[PDB]
Short mmCIF file of all heavy atoms in Angstrom, two decimals:
data_model
loop_
_atom_site.label_atom_id
_atom_site.label_comp_id
_atom_site.label_asym_id
_atom_site.label_seq_id
_atom_site.Cartn_x
_atom_site.Cartn_y
_atom_site.Cartn_z
N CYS I 132 9.17 -1.15 1.07
CA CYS I 132 8.70 -2.08 1.93
C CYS I 132 9.02 -3.43 1.56
O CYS I 132 8.87 -3.79 0.43
CB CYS I 132 7.26 -1.81 2.14
SG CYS I 132 6.41 -3.23 3.19
N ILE I 133 9.54 -4.30 2.56
CA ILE I 133 9.95 -5.62 2.28
C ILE I 133 9.26 -6.54 3.12
O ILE I 133 9.61 -7.72 3.35
CB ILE I 133 11.41 -5.81 2.45
CG1 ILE I 133 11.94 -5.25 3.68
CG2 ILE I 133 12.23 -5.18 1.31
CD1 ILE I 133 13.45 -5.43 4.22
N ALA I 134 8.04 -6.09 3.71
CA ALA I 134 7.19 -6.80 4.53
C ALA I 134 7.86 -7.65 5.78
O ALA I 134 7.51 -8.66 6.07
CB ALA I 134 6.44 -7.89 3.69
N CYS I 135 8.84 -6.82 6.30
CA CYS I 135 9.46 -7.46 7.52
C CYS I 135 8.39 -7.37 8.71
O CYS I 135 8.68 -7.92 9.73
CB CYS I 135 10.68 -6.67 7.94
SG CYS I 135 10.45 -4.88 8.09
N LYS I 136 7.26 -6.63 8.49
CA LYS I 136 6.26 -6.39 9.54
C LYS I 136 6.66 -6.05 10.85
O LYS I 136 5.99 -6.26 11.80
CB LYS I 136 5.60 -7.98 9.63
CG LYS I 136 4.67 -8.31 8.49
CD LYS I 136 4.45 -9.79 8.45
CE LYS I 136 3.31 -10.20 7.60
NZ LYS I 136 2.00 -10.13 8.23
N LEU I 137 7.83 -5.28 10.88
CA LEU I 137 8.20 -4.58 12.03
C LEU I 137 7.13 -3.55 12.32
O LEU I 137 6.76 -3.20 13.46
CB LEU I 137 9.56 -3.92 11.82
CG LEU I 137 10.73 -4.91 11.85
CD1 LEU I 137 12.04 -4.20 11.44
CD2 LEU I 137 10.77 -5.71 13.02
N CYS I 138 6.69 -2.77 11.29
CA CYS I 138 5.70 -1.73 11.51
C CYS I 138 4.40 -2.23 12.09
O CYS I 138 3.84 -1.63 13.01
CB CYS I 138 5.36 -1.00 10.10
SG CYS I 138 4.65 -2.16 8.94
N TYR I 164 -1.42 -4.39 2.11
CA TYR I 164 -0.71 -3.41 2.99
C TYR I 164 -1.85 -2.35 3.18
O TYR I 164 -2.11 -1.51 2.34
CB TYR I 164 0.53 -2.79 2.41
CG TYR I 164 1.28 -2.09 3.35
CD1 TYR I 164 2.46 -2.71 3.89
CD2 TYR I 164 1.15 -0.75 3.77
CE1 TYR I 164 3.29 -2.10 4.79
CE2 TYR I 164 1.84 -0.07 4.65
CZ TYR I 164 2.98 -0.74 5.25
OH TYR I 164 3.76 -0.15 6.04
N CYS I 181 10.71 1.26 11.01
CA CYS I 181 11.10 0.72 9.73
C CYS I 181 12.54 0.99 9.31
O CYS I 181 13.06 2.05 9.46
CB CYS I 181 10.16 1.48 8.66
SG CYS I 181 10.37 0.62 6.94
N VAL I 183 14.10 0.53 6.41
CA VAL I 183 14.44 0.85 5.12
C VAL I 183 13.83 2.13 4.63
O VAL I 183 13.60 2.31 3.49
CB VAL I 183 14.08 -0.37 4.14
CG1 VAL I 183 15.01 -1.51 4.25
CG2 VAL I 183 12.63 -0.83 4.52
N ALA I 185 10.70 2.87 4.48
CA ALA I 185 9.51 2.55 3.64
C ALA I 185 8.34 3.43 4.04
O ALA I 185 7.75 4.08 3.21
CB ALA I 185 9.22 1.07 3.68
N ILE I 186 7.80 3.19 5.23
CA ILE I 186 6.60 3.92 5.74
C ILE I 186 7.06 5.20 6.44
O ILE I 186 7.98 5.32 7.17
CB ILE I 186 5.88 3.01 6.79
CG1 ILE I 186 4.58 3.72 7.27
CG2 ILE I 186 6.85 2.62 7.96
CD1 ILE I 186 3.60 3.92 6.24
S1 SF4 K 502 6.70 -0.66 5.91
FE1 SF4 K 502 8.81 -1.01 6.73
S2 SF4 K 502 8.57 -1.89 8.69
FE2 SF4 K 502 6.61 -2.07 7.73
S3 SF4 K 502 6.66 -4.09 6.80
FE3 SF4 K 502 7.35 -2.68 5.14
S4 SF4 K 502 9.59 -2.68 5.34
FE4 SF4 K 502 8.85 -3.72 7.46
#
Side-chain angles (χ1 to χ4, degrees):
Chain I
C132 169
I133 47 172
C135 60
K136 285 162 163 274
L137 294 174
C138 62
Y164 197 98
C181 191
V183 285
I186 181 65

